[PDB]
Each structure stands twice: as C-alpha cells, then as structure tokens.
C-alpha cells in the first residue's frame, strides 16, 4: 500500500470500508455495538482532544476488530500549513494515541479531504497512507431525521451503485449513528458485502496499519 498517495477505492473484491471521522464522541459506543451486531469492522479517523480524552474508546475500537486511523490533532486543513505544521499535526496526534494503544496509526485521512504536493510529501516522510473517500454521505449537512435518509442515505446508495467503496461519515453526529449507520449496515448485509477496515480492504495485514 503506497504512502503519500491519495487512496479513494478498496482493492479487495466485495469489500466496503465504512469510515467515521472526527471522533471519538459520545455516540461512538452505540456505533461500535451496532457494528458488532453486523460482524462489520470499521475505521475511525480520530482527532487530538477527542482521542486524549477517550483512550478507552480507542481500545474498544482495536479490541473489537476496528482500525484506528489519524485525522490530525486540530482538524486544520493541511495545505494551509508548512512542512513543520503538517508534521506536528500528525506527531501530536501520535503522542496522544500511543499511550492508549502502544502504537500509532500508519493510515490517515486529511481534514476536508484537502491535500497538495507538500502534504503528500510529509505523509510519505512520516510513513502515512493517505485515505480519501469514494462515497461521501454529506452526513454533517443532513442532521435531521428526514434529511439524513433523503440525501445522505440516497447519496450512499447512488455512490455505492456507482462502485464507490470507501464511505465517509462522521460518528460525532447524532443522526449518523441513530439512523444512517443502521441503514448502511442493512444495505451491506442485504448486498453481499464484507464490511471491513480500510487496511484490510487494501490488502494490508493488521500489522501494517500501525507504526
Ligand atoms: Cl432511501
Ligand atoms: Co474531519
Ligand atoms: Na485509489
Ligand atoms: Na476498553
């Protein structure tokens, strides 16, 4: 799996990577229970303060077969920073994850999906795989019981049908965990799909998901 190169598509047949940004949050526990119910493994791209404050959730993620990835400490668009600012965004997050897991993610997702050549260079240098998305649910814009189905689920089905398989949602949001995640899992199960972690969907052994 190359480092410092935008990845948007799984490479394993019949897999889909449900991925959740900006946590962990107060809704993460209900989301993990829901995932285990469907034997589904997901990927959580986590933030600095949320990770510092929630080392138990990180551990529940790993213990339960999920992948913890990096989402920067402060959620700042990385093309806005110079070499040292990008680097510090990643290393400050590593230093708050390592005490919880004993290791740090070697996969990350750029905030707002924004990259440029400089951020990919830093990610190559820090040994990160850079995960974007091919199914964007826009769940953060659709936080209402009708919107989250009308648009976010609809977007999910339309992009899934078009062959998209790295699904972006945010487990910080109530309606994502209360309504969208259940609808996406029912769809996974109905179709014949394997919901697994981003690393596994890319043919990477679990050992390579951390460094
Ligand atoms: Cl629908
Ligand atoms: Co984010
Ligand atoms: Na790709
Ligand atoms: Na635990």
Author numbering: 27 to 237
Study text:
We have cloned a similar chitin deacetylase (EAA66447) from Aspergillus nidulans FGSC A4 and carried out an extensive characterization of the recombinant enzyme, with an appended short N-terminal His-tag, produced in E. coli. AnCDA seems to have broader substrate specificity than other characterized members of the CE4 family and the enzyme seems well suited to act on chitin and its partially deacetylated forms.
To characterize the nature of the substrate-binding site in AnCDA, we determined the crystal structure of the enzyme to 2.0 Å resolution. The structure shows the expected (β/α)8 barrel topology as well as a CE4 active site architecture, including the His-His-Asp metal-binding triad (H97, H101, D48), a catalytic acid (His196, aiding sugar departure) and a catalytic base (Asp47, activating the nucleophilic water), similar to the active site of ClCDA9. Despite the fact that no metals were added in the crystallization solution, there is clear evidence for a metal ion bound to the His-His-Asp triad, with a peak >14 σ in the 2Fo-Fc map. The ion, refined as cobalt, adopts an octahedral coordination in which the other three ligands are a bidentate phosphate molecule from the crystallization solvent and a water. The phosphate ion in AnCDA occupies the position where the acetyl-group of the to-be-deacetylated sugar, i.e. the sugar bound in subsite 0, is located. Interestingly, AnCDA (and ClCDA) have a lysine (Lys164 in AnCDA) within hydrogen-bonding distance to the sugar bound in subsite +1, creating a positively charged environment. Another interesting feature of the AnCDA structure is the presence of a cluster of large aromatic residues on the surface of the protein near the catalytic centre and the −1 subsite. This cluster is composed of Tyr53, which is a phenylalanine in ClCDA and tyrosine in all three putative A. nidulans deacetylases, and Tyr200 and Trp201, which are unique to AnCDA.
